[PDB]
Amino acid sequence: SDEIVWQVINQSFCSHRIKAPNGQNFCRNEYNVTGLCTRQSCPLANSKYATVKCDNGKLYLYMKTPERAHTPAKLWERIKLSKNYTKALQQIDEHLLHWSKFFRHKCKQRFTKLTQVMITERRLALREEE
């Protein structure tokens, strides 16, 4: 049913979709790795999916499988990426072993950017402590 769901979401109301002036579309979905409404992008469209998303200081990895499509409360499995960037990429590749290259590449890029953002918000909010 993923194709049907995607086609309805495409030619009907993807509520998280925002139509930019260029004509490109952006899904507002927080779990979305690539914030662009496409076949590979909407977590709604695709049963198999993954994302790096920041919670507190941690940069967790969220996993989505067709097996837990029912029971959406427990759908997203939460994995802690190690603070070491190399270890984090290794863990992402391991968990995303035998996993389509699109989500893996996008997940790695999102982890890099979130790490940079965490570094730079530490920068902007440096305090006298320590």
Binding site: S1, D2, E3, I4
Partner: protein, 52 residues
């Protein structure tokens, strides 16, 4: 009882649930399959090489 099942009358006079034009919702499963790829000729590059 209100709408009916495979072997149960819908309780609406002369009503049956609609049939599916396509038996499978997901076209990716069907297009991939196992036998089609045996039937299919080798693929192209998917990004045409510019000639001339």
């Amino acid at each position: 009882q209100v709408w009916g099942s495979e072997t149960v009358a819908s309780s609406k006079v002369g009503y049956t649930l609609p049939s599916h034009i396509i038996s499978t919702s997901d076209v990716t499963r069907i297009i991939n399959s196992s036998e089609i790829q045996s039937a299919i000729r080798p693929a192209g590059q998917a990004t045409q090489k510019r000639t001339h």
